[PDB]
């Protein structure tokens, strides 16, 4: 039963062995039943950690490669190693994507859950876009944008910016506009509109929601300055 | 060629993912060549990190099991056993490589590989159970003894290898043998011997030696406490 896998996931988390946590929640996804917000958060953390490690690795190898473009044969070997990383990163992204598309997104009944999973789909497609080039990049970026816009249009109707999942969506959506759509002015406009829409009710949040909201809004504010700089 | 393998390992190290680093250094060593201090250091970094992540996990899981009052405890035990089998497999993978290629082949090299053998047997001892816990430790003390002999005869007390032997052997004495007096004796001996050359250390090894001595002083405080 998935109830047991939940404990297994927490165990894999505390050990900093996210691969097993992901393998556990992956099978929790294949149960077809609707995940509770706790399980949803666990699955988010799991794949976010697993992809992040490869993202960091890829950026490091890529940088080393571009730093040594004059090194001939060893540059060639470094490139082979880099591609050998990229296929892993892509496989992890496609794994989580297919899981979301075939089990979580089809089943999500709650507006909140719909937003969370659509957002996650967008995020993982963005991580693929960061890796891809040409028409591959175009197709991945288009579907990522499609997912974010769908989540944005849903959350705009169903949730105030006083809820952290809406802010999380706005932050990541703005990052996509800036980093992937190459639209920094659009990114800043989106981020600022979300931040000031939040400011309008920032003192109405609950004890936990205000902490969560502030934790996200401070990132919104900092990204705004980082991009305007 | 060994040079390209070494380069790929270096690349994996820079990428900060070590499993592929270890898997490349393994085949570098299967050529039967004497690993120079750079590739030797790379190999140590590789297997040390590959085992260390599992070690942390095992400690954490063992703590959770102890925190249990059931399927909960059964599951924790099973995950612990999975981690231990992984860690055991990697340690065996290293010990056989040393026994088949590195330990069969300078005094410094000899001592480095023997110490490595001891430390890998010690990491097994941290996960071991049953009467074979003694056999694991036995093989560890055997290697550490050969290391201590070669180092006392051919390594100045300024040598970082000679100090690492005593530090780990003492950790073995306190954590595996619960003998703080045995640990503190060897540790203090090494510490004062290094101090007898406190100004004789090399420009880089000053920091190396003092860091080892700082750890020695701290664990000395721990075992005396």
């Amino acid at each position: 039963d998935k109830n047991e896998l939940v404990q297994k996931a927490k165990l894999a988390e505390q050990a900093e062995r996210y691969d097993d946590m992901a393998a556990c929640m992956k099978s929790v996804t294949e149960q077809g039943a609707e995940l509770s917000n706790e399980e949803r958060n666990l699955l988010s953390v799991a794949y976010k950690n697993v992809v992040g490690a490869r993202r960091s690795s890829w950026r490091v190898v890529s940088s080393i490669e571009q730093k040594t473009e004059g090194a001939e044969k060893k540059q060639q070997m470094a490139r082979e190693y880099r591609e050998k990383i990229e296929t892993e990163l892509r496989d992890i992204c496609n794994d989580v994507l297919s899981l979301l598309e075939k089990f979580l997104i089809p089943n999500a009944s709650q507006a909140e859950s719909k937003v969370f999973y659509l957002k996650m789909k967008g995020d993982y497609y963005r991580y693929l876009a960061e890796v891809a080039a040409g028409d591959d990049k175009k197709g991945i970026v288009d579907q990522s944008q499609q997912a974010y816009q769908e989540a944005f249009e849903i959350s705009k109707k169903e949730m105030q910016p006083t809820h952290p999942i809406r802010l999380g969506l706005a932050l990541n959506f703005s990052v996509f506009y800036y980093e992937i759509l190459n639209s920094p002015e659009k990114a800043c406009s989106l981020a600022k509109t979300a931040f000031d829409e939040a400011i309008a009710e920032l003192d109405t949040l609950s004890e936990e929601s205000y902490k969560d909201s502030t934790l996200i809004m401070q990132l919104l504010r900092d990204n705004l300055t980082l991009w305007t700089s | 060629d060994k040079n390209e393998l070494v380069q790929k390992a270096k690349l994996a190290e820079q990428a900060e993912r070590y499993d592929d680093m270890a898997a490349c250094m393994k085949s570098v060593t299967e050529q039967g060549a004497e690993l120079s201090n750079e590739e030797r250091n790379l190999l140590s970094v590789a297997y040390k990190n590959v085992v260390g992540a599992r070690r942390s996990s095992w400690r954490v899981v063992s703590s959770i099991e102890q925190k249990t009052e059931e399927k909960k405890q059964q599951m924790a035990r099973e995950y612990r056993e999975k981690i231990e089998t992984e860690l055991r497999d990697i340690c065996n993978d290293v010990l056989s490589l040393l026994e088949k290629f590195l330990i069969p082949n300078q005094a410094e090299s000899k001592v480095f590989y023997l110490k490595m053998k001891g430390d890998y047997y010690r990491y097994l001892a941290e996960v071991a159970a049953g009467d074979d816990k003694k056999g694991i430790v036995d093989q560890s003390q055997q290697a550490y003894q050969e290391a201590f002999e070669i180092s006392k005869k051919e390594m100045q007390p300024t040598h970082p290898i000679r100090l690492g032997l005593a530090l780990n052997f003492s950790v073995f004495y306190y954590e595996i043998l619960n003998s703080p007096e045995k640990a503190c004796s060897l540790a203090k001996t090494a510490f004062d011997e290094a101090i007898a050359e406190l100004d004789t250390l090399s420009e880089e090894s000053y920091k190396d030696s003092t860091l080892i001595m700082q750890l020695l002083r701290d664990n000395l405080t721990l075992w005396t406490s």
């Binding site: 990132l219 | 140590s44 780990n168």
Partner: peptide, 16 residues
Amino acid sequence: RSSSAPNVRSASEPSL
């Protein structure tokens, strides 16, 4: 516990 031996730019959306 004991001690043992030494060795030899965008603002992305943060997690919960």
